[PDB]
Every structure is written in structure tokens, then in C-alpha cells.
Design a protein around this ligand. Structure first.
Ligand code: CL
Ligand code: CL
Ligand code: CL
Ligand code: CL
Ligand code: CL
Ligand code: CL
Ligand code: CL
Ligand code: CL
Ligand code: CL
Ligand code: CL
Ligand code: CL
Ligand code: CL
Ligand code: CL
Ligand code: CL
Ligand code: CL
Ligand code: CL
Ligand code: CL
Ligand code: CL
Ligand code: CL
Ligand code: CL
Ligand code: CL
Ligand code: CL
Ligand code: CL
Ligand code: CL
Ligand code: CL
Ligand code: CL
Ligand code: CL
Ligand code: CL
Ligand code: CL
Ligand code: CL
Ligand code: CL
Ligand code: CL
Ligand code: CL
Ligand code: CL
Ligand code: CL
Ligand code: CL
Ligand code: CL
Ligand code: CL
Ligand code: CL
Ligand code: CL
Ligand code: CL
Ligand code: CL
Ligand code: CL
Ligand code: CL
Ligand code: CL
Ligand code: CL
Ligand code: CL
Ligand code: CL
Ligand code: CL
Ligand code: CL
Ligand code: FE
Ligand code: FE
Ligand code: FE
Ligand code: FE
Ligand code: FE
Ligand code: FE
Ligand code: MG
Ligand code: MG
Ligand code: MG
Ligand code: MG
Ligand code: MG
Ligand code: MG
Ligand code: MG
Ligand code: MG
Ligand code: MG
Ligand code: MG
Ligand code: MG
Ligand code: MG
Ligand code: MG
Ligand code: MG
Ligand code: MG
Ligand code: MG
Ligand code: MG
Ligand code: MG
Ligand code: MG
Ligand code: MG
Ligand code: MG
Ligand code: MG
Ligand code: MG
Ligand code: MG
Ligand code: MG
Ligand code: MG
Ligand code: MG
Ligand code: MG
Ligand code: MG
Ligand code: MG
Ligand code: MG
Ligand code: MG
Ligand code: MG
Ligand code: MG
Ligand code: MG
Ligand code: MG
Ligand code: MG
Ligand code: MG
Ligand code: MG
Ligand code: MG
Ligand code: MG
Ligand code: MG
Ligand code: MG
Ligand code: MG
Ligand code: MG
Ligand code: MG
Ligand code: MG
Ligand code: MG
Ligand code: MG
Ligand code: MG
Ligand code: MG
Ligand code: MG
Lengths: 174, 174, 174, 174, 174, 174
């Protein structure tokens, strides 16, 4: 029950919001793992889509680990929950997967912006700086990259053009 | 519905048993992630326990990825489920965590032995060879290592001796 | 007539089944040699299809040589038969050749699975291990690769699109 | 039916004679493969005889591939036939195998000389030059080498002397 | 009395069969040590026979050590017995020693095949894989090598020809 | 029956005493092999004790081989006997194993001193020099090292202190 010897200026609500964000990052890791192996199917067979999303999956696990480290640095206590299976429809196509990833990374961003508003409301400048330094620009860059990919696939003629997704796989993802 | 162009000698029951094993490997990854950050707490502070279990966590993710690759190689279809939160009590001590890891790795082994018995019953020698080559000896070595660690911690006087867990952290895990 | 000084636990039926497999591997070598030089024709002119199938042809010769080595290791006697000319229709297109190779590599796999069932029935664990180690996963990987190639050529618009086969030749086979 | 865009000065009879030579080179490859694994038997056990004939086997496959390349260069169409199993008696001894190889390489030479006489009769100087450059001196050197080997084995006391074949294996073939 | 914390799917009969195999491997080590120093006698004086059998002796000790490691990995308990002195007649000649080694390595193989049949009967796929991976192909290669050596010594004129054994010592064993 | 051409000043009693010493060195090798794998058990788990005694085991085999070489150098005839299984009680602890090794190495020394007294009585200065050069100081150093190890384990609180044996394993044996 009694207080961590390190804890200072770290609100219980911030502690709980960090636990929720840990779960969301692990969920995002799981979504990208599912998307990766869709592209490894013999009836999809886009190997650079598969490698792109597997790298994105490993990056989300790193994002979760850094928040776990933060929770202990500040003297909070990690509380884990089930990692839900990916909730998105049939992956369908390279374009549809990229659109689902864009939606995922905007939802993660909205969670981080809510977390920053809480840390601001609780006058926790260390936590605000942590979120800004390690998360907010990463999300802005991830969202911009996924928007660019969606735009190129649309302009090339995906998802009806299997030639489009094949050539995008080689020239952008390769 | 209709059959993968690659599928040959791969029973629906084997396909489903591989999906169950994927989930178990992801669960084991999650248990070791939880155990790792327990040792990173300021009131536990055993950094080489933390690094040992984080490495074990990354190895279980690799184990899951290789089964996902196998499912697609054989023309089965990956089906994911929720990854349950770790089910073990309060982690308590270095000795208790090592005993929980031993129990986890014996349960994983029992699942793999059931999977091998199914593959044998369905006359699937490729799947039997896959399990033998990539999983069964890894489990035997993991179980032996964890037994050795439990034995040393017990002999040194854990968990009552905090000096025991400290010196094990430096000399065996360091 | 009298028995090889090395022979032990090696059934006459296994000896004969190995001779049949030697012939099948040499036949597969011959099919891929024919397919390779089809793509070297001035009215087909896909040089990386030609190199891919010539490499596959040399690999099948290696597969045959290793079974010849096994026959002598176990004290059986090699018996050769005619290598039949390739039995497949006009090669027609890059897609049709890839579909014929997929069919060839699944027929070779079925022969190896029958050979493994015989070795299992005759309690020959050395022969079972030989087939598992050197043949079964090679076939699974070959079949998965050819399925992936067929899928990409179909999605790109082959065989009606000569642009599809040209670009596949450069980006996947090159 | 209609004519290759590359074809010039290439008679239908030359085209057919090249297809026959392709088959003969593949047959020679097969004879030397059989001879090689005879020397790998546990009751023959002459490892450098085995390696010598396996190298000769790979060289005949190269000889066949170069004629396949020539057929396409000139705008003819490859037509394959069954590769007959080796027609020679029991291999018996190192000396007998070397005498069978000498007979094989003289029969191949006679085929090439007939092919050159046809190319001369059809005023095809490119084909005459191809045969001279890549085949005729290779055959003369192969025949001379095999004659030398037969002579040494005879002088040493083969095939009655197993010591002769053993020492030839180490000093000439090693 | 009570059970090893590591033991899983490891039958008491398999445990005892592994102890018997340990003894057999140490016995084989001892036979080859005796054979080695026979060839080091001043009235035999074949130094490369001596080095060949001493290497074979050290390899059998490694074979025994790996089974001791396996027994502990699986949570069985090593039980040692006397290592009997070599049971073979006067070593007599290089040919006779090679024939005794062939007989030794076929008896070791038969023991391993019985051990594999037991592990199969007890549904122990880890133990089956261990025997296949580390022992069965090693025995097949050892038996084939010794058959080849016996064949060459016989063909050269051993054991009546001391020149045969001398030249085999230099060219095959050197 | 008749005399080795090399034999000079080598008494039949010395020849027999060397055969007895060969057996004792092989016995010592076997004792240390048993002790090594005791420390590899999952319920003992002292890896540097295991490596120390395995090295000691390989050194005793070298000691036996050098005496076998000596027997042939002097024109005696090696006569082997069964290698008895280790005769020591349950190994129990690191301290008890070290005390058993001290007792083993003093018994080996006493045998060598008896062998030297015989060689002195038979006026065999070559054999006296061989024993002095290759055995007597090795035994003195081995006995002193084992006494030092026993002393440290006793002073640290073994065998009741499992922490003592653990820390000795890392700092002296590591
Ligand atoms: Cl606070
Ligand atoms: Cl608070
Ligand atoms: Cl939960
Ligand atoms: Cl829900
Ligand atoms: Cl603030
Ligand atoms: Cl950034
Ligand atoms: Cl930026
Ligand atoms: Cl950007
Ligand atoms: Cl199927
Ligand atoms: Cl099914
Ligand atoms: Cl679910
Ligand atoms: Cl539940
Ligand atoms: Cl099976
Ligand atoms: Cl392994
Ligand atoms: Cl291992
Ligand atoms: Cl281990
Ligand atoms: Cl048999
Ligand atoms: Cl039979
Ligand atoms: Cl035939
Ligand atoms: Cl037919
Ligand atoms: Cl079997
Ligand atoms: Cl493989
Ligand atoms: Cl693989
Ligand atoms: Cl693959
Ligand atoms: Cl023309
Ligand atoms: Cl014409
Ligand atoms: Cl035909
Ligand atoms: Cl015919
Ligand atoms: Cl002309
Ligand atoms: Cl030339
Ligand atoms: Cl020349
Ligand atoms: Cl010449
Ligand atoms: Cl058990
Ligand atoms: Cl039992
Ligand atoms: Cl006994
Ligand atoms: Cl007895
Ligand atoms: Cl089994
Ligand atoms: Cl092997
Ligand atoms: Cl092999
Ligand atoms: Cl071999
Ligand atoms: Cl010579
Ligand atoms: Cl004397
Ligand atoms: Cl005397
Ligand atoms: Cl005895
Ligand atoms: Cl007794
Ligand atoms: Cl003296
Ligand atoms: Cl010394
Ligand atoms: Cl000294
Ligand atoms: Cl000293
Ligand atoms: Cl210390
Ligand atoms: Fe993230
Ligand atoms: Fe795992
Ligand atoms: Fe093949
Ligand atoms: Fe040729
Ligand atoms: Fe062995
Ligand atoms: Fe010694
Ligand atoms: Mg959430
Ligand atoms: Mg990302
Ligand atoms: Mg709290
Ligand atoms: Mg749900
Ligand atoms: Mg979506
Ligand atoms: Mg800032
Ligand atoms: Mg920044
Ligand atoms: Mg960062
Ligand atoms: Mg930045
Ligand atoms: Mg489950
Ligand atoms: Mg592990
Ligand atoms: Mg299905
Ligand atoms: Mg729950
Ligand atoms: Mg637990
Ligand atoms: Mg098996
Ligand atoms: Mg295997
Ligand atoms: Mg293995
Ligand atoms: Mg592995
Ligand atoms: Mg292994
Ligand atoms: Mg057939
Ligand atoms: Mg292939
Ligand atoms: Mg037969
Ligand atoms: Mg026909
Ligand atoms: Mg076809
Ligand atoms: Mg394998
Ligand atoms: Mg291979
Ligand atoms: Mg493999
Ligand atoms: Mg012909
Ligand atoms: Mg040649
Ligand atoms: Mg025509
Ligand atoms: Mg015929
Ligand atoms: Mg002939
Ligand atoms: Mg020239
Ligand atoms: Mg040339
Ligand atoms: Mg020339
Ligand atoms: Mg026995
Ligand atoms: Mg050996
Ligand atoms: Mg017991
Ligand atoms: Mg006896
Ligand atoms: Mg014998
Ligand atoms: Mg192997
Ligand atoms: Mg090995
Ligand atoms: Mg092997
Ligand atoms: Mg004695
Ligand atoms: Mg020593
Ligand atoms: Mg005597
Ligand atoms: Mg006794
Ligand atoms: Mg004792
Ligand atoms: Mg003196
Ligand atoms: Mg000295
Ligand atoms: Mg020395
Ligand atoms: Mg000295």
C-alpha cells in the first residue's frame, strides 16, 4: 500500500493512464503482427508489405517497454490487462491494411494527446516532456508516412490493380 | 473457403493446434515481460533478473513468429485470440519468479508434446520434424536451465536471503 | 547376391523405393532444364525465368546424387531407369511454367511422404531422419515459393499481360 | 509453324541433328553418373575414381546446355527425348569403367564428326566453327586422357591387381 | 527418491536404456584405445592406424559424455557400471582390426536402434530426435567408412601382404 | 613368446607394474567423469565444479595413454583389465567430492612411489626418470591444489553453506 521511495509529483490518475497506454501499445504491436503475416500468405505474397508491418510491430513493443520503464522510474506500479485480438475486418489488400494502420496510428495519437492533457492538468512537466520527446513526433511522422503510402497506392490504382500493389511493394517498401 | 494451392498432408486439426500454440507462445512472451519489469521496480532492483526475463520474452515472440510462418508455409490460416494477462500470483522474489518460469516452460513443453502426438496421429512427418528441430530441445534446455537456477537460489538461502538473490543476479545472470 | 557388409535395418522395399525416388529427382531435373531453355527462346526472351529454372534443375540433380550416396551408405544397390522426357504441355507462358513447377514439386513431395510412410512401417529411423532433414522442409519451402510466384503473376495480370511477366522477371527473379 | 525472326542459314536437318546431339550428351552425363556411384559402393570403395567420373558427368551436362543455347541462338526449337539408362555391362573394375568411358567418348566424337559433315554439306560455317571450337578438341583431349588411363591400369596389372587400381586412384586420380 | 523438478515425459525404462548406452560407448572407447596401441608396438609399427583408432577412441568418449549430459537434461540419474576390457581376439593385422571395428560399430548401431524403438514405444519425441540427430547418421557414416577400409585392404592383398597394410597406412590413413 | 627387438634393461616385474598403473589411471579418469556429471545434475547445478572435474578426467586419460606409449617404447606388452566403476559413496557436496579427489590423487601417488621403488630395485634409471619427469611432481601439485580447495570450502562453511559452494564455484573454479 505505502508509497514508493522514488515517487514525487506523480498523480494516481497519471499512473493509471500510463497503464492504459501500455495496453494500447501492446495492442498496436499485435495488429501489426497480424497484418504482417497476412502478406506472407501464399495467396497474398507481398514480402515487403510483410517485412514493413513486422518492423512496425517490433517498434510498438519497444513503445510499450519504454512506458513500462517510465512507470517504474516514477514509482508507479504496472498493471497489465489482456491484449485484445486485432479488431479490424479481413485485411483484403495492401491498400486496406495501410488504411487500417493509418486509423490505428491516429487512435494511438489521440490516446497520447489525452495523456498529455492529463499530465498538463496535474502539473507534471516530466511526464509532458516524456510524451513529447518519445511519442508525439514519432506519431506525427508515422501518420504522415502512412498517409503518403495510402495516397500512392490509390493513385497507382489499388486495390483493383494487383500490379499497383506489386510495384509499390518493390519500389517503396523494398 | 476453397483450398490453398500449397496445402498437402496438413490436417485441419493440426492447423487448429498450431493456432493454439501461437497463442500460448505469445502468452509466454507476456508472462516474461511482466516478470522482467517486476525486477526493474525501485523496491526489487535486480537488473540482471530484469534483463534475463526480457530476453526470454523476446525469444517467446520469435517462437510465435516461426509458428505463424509455418502456418502459412503449409497453407493453413492464422487465427488469433486475445493474449491473456499473466495469471501467476504476486512475483514476490527472484526464486518465486524462476519457479513460475519453470512451471510456464513445462506447460509449454506439454502443449508441444500434445502437438507432436497429433502430428504423429495424422502421419505429418514435416510437422513432427518442425516441432523436434525448432521446439522440443529448446524446451528441454530451457527447463534444465531454470531448474539449475531454482536449485542455486534455494541452496544460497533465497528467498529470505536478499544477499543470495543479489549475488545470484551478479554471478549467474550478469 | 550375398549381403553388403554395411547393411543393417535396411529393408529391400526401402532400397527399391529409394531407386524410384532417384529416378523422380532426375526427371524433375529434366523438366526444369526444358522449362529453362523455353525462356531462352528468342520469341519468349525472359532471361531471369531461364536462370531461375536452370538453378532449380541443378538443385534436383543434387537431390538425386544425395539419394545415390544414401543408397550406398546403407548397403543397397542403385538401379537406374530411363529418365522420361518432360510430360507437360507446351510451356506457353511464365505463369503456366510456374504452375507446372508447383504441380511437379507437389508430386515429388507426395512421393517423399510415401517413402517416409514406408520407412516408418519398416521401423527405419535413420531413413526417416534422412528424408526429414534433407527433403521434406526443402519441398515445403519450394512449394510455398512457387505458390507465391503463381499468386503474384496472376495478380499482375499474366498470362495476357506480357508487361506483367516482363516486370516479374526483373523484380522477383532478377 | 512460321519462321523464327533470328533464323538464317540454319537447315532443318542441322536443327534435328543438334537435338540428337543434345540427347547423346545427356546420355553420356548419365553413364558417368552411374560409373561414379559404382566406385562409391562399400565393396568397390575407390573415392577418386568416384570423383573423376562425377566431374566427367557434370561436364557432359554443360556440353548439353551449350547445345541447347546454340539451338535457340540459331532460331531452332529444342526437342527432347527420353535419356536412356546406361547400356554398359556390370562396371566390374576401374579398368573396365575406363575402357567403357573411352568407348563412350569415341562414340560421342563420331556423332560430332557426322554433325560437322552435315554442317559442311549445308554450307553452315557458324555451326562448323561452333563444333570445332567447343567440342572437337575437347573430345580429342578426353579420348587421349582415357587412353592414357587405360594404358597405365593395364601396365600396373589391373584388373586382377586390386593394389594397381588402389594406387592409380591415389597417384593419377588423387 | 522423489521426482526431479525438470523431468517430463521421460520413462524409467528410457532412463535405464540411456545408462546402458553410456556403458557401451565407454566400452567402444576402450576397444579403440586397445587397437590404437597395438599399432604402436615395435613389431606392428603402423603409426597412422595407431592415430586413426586413437581418434575413434576419443570420439566414443565424446559420445558417452553427450549421453551423460542428456540423462541430466531430462532429469534421469546416471548409473555407471564397470567398463569391460576389450573382448576381441589378438588384434593380428590392420585388416583384422578394421573388421573388429566394423563389428563393434554395427553392434553399437543395433543398441541405438533398440533405444530408438523404446523411445518410440514410450512416445518420447525429444529422445527420438536426440538419437537421430547425434547418433544414427554418425553410425551409418562410421560403418560405411570401415566397410570401405576393409574392402580396400582385402583388394590390396592384406593381411598376407605387409606391403598392402604399409601403403594403406600412408595413402588412406595418412 | 620370444623377446622384443627393442627390449633392454626392462624387468618383467616393471612391465606388469606399468600395466597395473595404466588401469589405475583409467580408473581415476572414470572417477572424475562421474564426479563431473554429479555437478551437472539439476539438483546440484555447480557448472564450474562440473568443468573442473571433466578437465581432471581428460588429464587422467592422457596419463594412461603416456604409460601405454612407455610400455611399447620399452618393448613390454600392454595388458588391459576392466575399469571398475567409481567406488566412492554418494558424491553429496562440492566439499565431499574435493575430499574424495584428494584421497584418489594420494592413492595414485602411493602407487607411483611403489612403481619407482620397484624401478630403483631393478636398476632401471630410464623408468625412474620417466616416473619423476611425467608423474611425481604432477601428483604433488594435484594434491596441494586439492588440499587448498578442501581448506577454502571448509573455511567458507561448506557443506552446510550452499552459498559457500556457489561462491567457490564462481571465484576459484570460474
Ligand atoms: Cl506523488
Ligand atoms: Cl495522487
Ligand atoms: Cl484483464
Ligand atoms: Cl470485450
Ligand atoms: Cl506542468
Ligand atoms: Cl521523434
Ligand atoms: Cl521531424
Ligand atoms: Cl515526415
Ligand atoms: Cl491437406
Ligand atoms: Cl483435414
Ligand atoms: Cl479472442
Ligand atoms: Cl477467462
Ligand atoms: Cl508420420
Ligand atoms: Cl535446440
Ligand atoms: Cl543439447
Ligand atoms: Cl543443457
Ligand atoms: Cl538389413
Ligand atoms: Cl528385407
Ligand atoms: Cl529402364
Ligand atoms: Cl511409357
Ligand atoms: Cl522407426
Ligand atoms: Cl530445409
Ligand atoms: Cl523453414
Ligand atoms: Cl518459406
Ligand atoms: Cl534458315
Ligand atoms: Cl531448311
Ligand atoms: Cl521420347
Ligand atoms: Cl529401346
Ligand atoms: Cl561452309
Ligand atoms: Cl579445346
Ligand atoms: Cl590441345
Ligand atoms: Cl592431351
Ligand atoms: Cl516423467
Ligand atoms: Cl516411468
Ligand atoms: Cl558394475
Ligand atoms: Cl562377465
Ligand atoms: Cl513419439
Ligand atoms: Cl551426422
Ligand atoms: Cl550424410
Ligand atoms: Cl559416407
Ligand atoms: Cl606408393
Ligand atoms: Cl630386458
Ligand atoms: Cl625379467
Ligand atoms: Cl579383466
Ligand atoms: Cl571386485
Ligand atoms: Cl638405477
Ligand atoms: Cl611437473
Ligand atoms: Cl613445481
Ligand atoms: Cl603448487
Ligand atoms: Cl562475491
Ligand atoms: Fe506506439
Ligand atoms: Fe516458446
Ligand atoms: Fe527434388
Ligand atoms: Fe560431351
Ligand atoms: Fe559411439
Ligand atoms: Fe594420473
Ligand atoms: Mg485501452
Ligand atoms: Mg510505427
Ligand atoms: Mg498504488
Ligand atoms: Mg473479444
Ligand atoms: Mg481497419
Ligand atoms: Mg521538450
Ligand atoms: Mg523531439
Ligand atoms: Mg524514440
Ligand atoms: Mg523529435
Ligand atoms: Mg491456449
Ligand atoms: Mg526461453
Ligand atoms: Mg480453412
Ligand atoms: Mg481475465
Ligand atoms: Mg507461478
Ligand atoms: Mg520421427
Ligand atoms: Mg529430426
Ligand atoms: Mg536439434
Ligand atoms: Mg531455433
Ligand atoms: Mg537441437
Ligand atoms: Mg517414377
Ligand atoms: Mg527447387
Ligand atoms: Mg540386392
Ligand atoms: Mg514416352
Ligand atoms: Mg504442367
Ligand atoms: Mg531441418
Ligand atoms: Mg539440404
Ligand atoms: Mg530444416
Ligand atoms: Mg541418339
Ligand atoms: Mg570429359
Ligand atoms: Mg520448326
Ligand atoms: Mg531400355
Ligand atoms: Mg562398356
Ligand atoms: Mg580450340
Ligand atoms: Mg569449352
Ligand atoms: Mg582448342
Ligand atoms: Mg552393455
Ligand atoms: Mg567413430
Ligand atoms: Mg530414479
Ligand atoms: Mg572379464
Ligand atoms: Mg573382433
Ligand atoms: Mg542429421
Ligand atoms: Mg554430433
Ligand atoms: Mg546428419
Ligand atoms: Mg589396480
Ligand atoms: Mg589432475
Ligand atoms: Mg612378455
Ligand atoms: Mg564391482
Ligand atoms: Mg571418497
Ligand atoms: Mg635418481
Ligand atoms: Mg620436472
Ligand atoms: Mg607432463
Ligand atoms: Mg617438474
Amino acid at each position: 500500500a505505502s508509497t514508493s521511495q522514488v515517487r514525487q509529483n506523480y498523480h494516481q490518475d497519471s499512473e493509471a493512464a500510463i497503464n492504459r497506454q501500455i495496453n494500447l501499445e501492446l495492442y498496436a504491436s499485435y495488429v501489426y503482427l497480424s497484418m504482417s503475416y497476412y502478406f506472407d500468405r501464399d495467396d497474398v505474397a507481398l514480402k515487403n508489405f510483410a517485412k514493413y508491418f513486422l518492423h512496425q510491430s517490433h517498434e510498438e513493443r519497444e513503445h510499450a517497454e519504454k512506458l513500462m520503464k517510465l512507470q517504474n522510474q516514477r514509482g508507479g506500479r504496472i498493471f497489465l490487462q489482456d491484449i485484445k485480438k486485432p479488431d479490424c475486418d479481413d485485411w483484403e489488400s495492401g491498400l486496406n491494411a495501410m488504411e487500417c494502420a493509418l486509423h490505428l496510428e491516429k487512435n494511438v495519437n489521440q490516446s497520447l494527446l489525452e495523456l498529455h492533457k492529463l499530465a498538463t492538468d496535474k502539473n507534471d512537466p516530466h511526464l509532458c516532456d516524456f510524451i513529447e520527446t518519445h511519442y508525439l513526433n514519432e506519431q506525427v511522422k508515422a501518420i504522415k508516412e502512412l498517409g503518403d503510402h495510402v495516397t500512392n497506392l490509390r493513385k497507382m490504382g489499388a486495390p483493383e490493380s494487383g500490379l499497383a500493389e506489386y510495384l509499390f511493394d518493390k519500389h517503396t517498401l523494398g
